[PDB]
Amino acid sequence: YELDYYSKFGHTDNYGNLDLRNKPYTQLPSGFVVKGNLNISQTPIKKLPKGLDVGGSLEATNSALKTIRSGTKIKGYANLLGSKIESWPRGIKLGGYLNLTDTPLKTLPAKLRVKGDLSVIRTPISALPEGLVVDGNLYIGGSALQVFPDTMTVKGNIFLGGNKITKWPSNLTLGGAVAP
Amino acid sequence: SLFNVFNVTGSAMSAESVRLNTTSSNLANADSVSSSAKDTYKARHAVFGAELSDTVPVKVMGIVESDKPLSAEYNPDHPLANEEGYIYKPNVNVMEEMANMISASRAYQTNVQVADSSKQMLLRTLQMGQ
Amino acid sequence: SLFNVFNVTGSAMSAESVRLNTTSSNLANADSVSSSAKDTYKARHAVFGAELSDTVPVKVMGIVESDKPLSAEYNPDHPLANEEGYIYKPNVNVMEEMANMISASRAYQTNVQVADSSKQMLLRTLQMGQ
Amino acid sequence: MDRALFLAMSGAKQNMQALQLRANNLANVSTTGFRADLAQARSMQAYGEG
């Protein structure tokens, strides 16, 4: 079934964080607003509603989340560890890091900006989008990436983690170090 | 060897200490409506795990929070009350914490006996050759 | 050839040492729920063997898991539970672990006396005719 | 020894302080124009390694 207004109230804390862990909810109403953090870990939710607003961070670790629609506003970070997300939509306003470890993610939006750290660890992604900007640490360990785009920006450390990079960006300014 | 018993039993001594501290924080936060970190505390549990990697030490793999819904109480005049007027309190269950308190103490003390038992065997093994 | 007793007593020391390590792991993992219902820890026990084809050494033939059914507990709060709110726990019985601890320690130290006394007989043999 | 001794002591100490705040409320039932004082507990975690 689907979450109602009264069922929403029974999964909210004092400061306004929605906890849906292991709960049997399949879809959320459109134009959904959360006062604080949102947790949809281990949920059978396969799609996030259009116009979704989260006043905190989105937690979807080891969930069945697959599709996020554009226009979603997230003030905190996005944690989609172990979910079933295959692509990242364009135009997501993310106020924090993006953790996509152990996901079937294949494609990323062009010129994507991550205000925090980025993770593509053990993902089947083949190539990073052109003009990528990362303000934190980039972990690509165990992924299928082997060629970086012509231009990219990482303001922290770059962790190869084991994968072999052969074509480095022509224009790259690094605020940290590169680790294998 | 008999020294591996000390590593295995010693790991359980630390393991049961983690669960005791987690229970202590649960008992002390059973009536705390507010919390720094913008999160209404929820009951935490230490999930043990055998690290097979003969001798199988026990390791704490991380603390996990309770899945029970928070206890909602209608307190309309509280500053933390929502529009409907309900304030939410942690889902700490007193009875399970008391049961965890007993089990953690009983398991902690029986690991001391095994370490003591292995100690005597090593001392006798050293008396051979003298 | 000249130290047949040492090979047998020493084999017992190594054999009884493994049984104590197995007991320590069973007691340290008596409350390790872990995950799923088939990866859950189960009480392990060494198997002693004697090949009687003079002296018959004792050889450990591998660790074998107990056949006792897992201890089921109703707890629809642990996130690692199942549809019916059950968490299966290791089939470790404390009373049988305490008895094994007593039996292993005493039997281990008994072979120390035999091995230590065996050396004395060898030392006295060197004094023959002197 | 174990730090759970002081972790529980730091909780029992606050319960007495909360009890004092409720005691002041009941002592002021007959007082004129008295606004009752609310008592609440804040959960603060010791962040660090471990």
Partner: peptide, 24 residues
């Protein structure tokens, strides 16, 4: 890995991925 919902002892920052927990 192991448990899927373990916590993190580091203070919230919302910008750095917590490496305290086994994030795999």
């Amino acid at each position: 890995a192991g448990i899927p919902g373990a916590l993190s002892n580091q203070p919230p920052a919302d910008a750095s991925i917590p490496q305290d927990v086994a994030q795999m």
